[PDB]
């Protein structure tokens, strides 16, 4: 497991796509990392296929698709204003 933090661009976006959830019965995986985005250019670097376990320190094993999606955009869970992600490549 490798931890990855980052911050959104001026439009508050990050530049990666997700899929899965409790509703899709799929683990939550990175679907694509657009180049040039923050998520493309962080160290350690996000990549397609990493499985996410936590977001800002929250176990999402039993959460849905729209629910997770709301978790990321909640720009207030971010300490120092960076979005913390824990993934399992």
């Amino acid at each position: 497991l490798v931890l990855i933090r980052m911050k959104p661009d001026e439009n508050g976006r990050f530049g990666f796509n997700v899929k899965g959830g409790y509703d899709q019965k799929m683990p939550v995986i990175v679907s694509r990392v657009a180049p040039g985005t923050p998520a493309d250019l962080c160290v350690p670097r996000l990549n397609e296929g990493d499985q996410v376990v936590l977001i800002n320190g929250r176990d999402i094993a039993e959460h849905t698709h729209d629910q997770v999606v709301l978790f990321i955009k909640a720009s207030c869970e971010r300490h120092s204003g960076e979005l913390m992600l824990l993934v399992r490549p």
Binding site: R13, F14, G15, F16, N17, V18, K19, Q24, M26, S31, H65, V69, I72, K73
Partner: peptide, 7 residues
């Protein structure tokens, strides 16, 4: 099909 969302 199965929904994927962009962030």
């Amino acid at each position: 099909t199965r929904r994927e969302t962009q962030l």
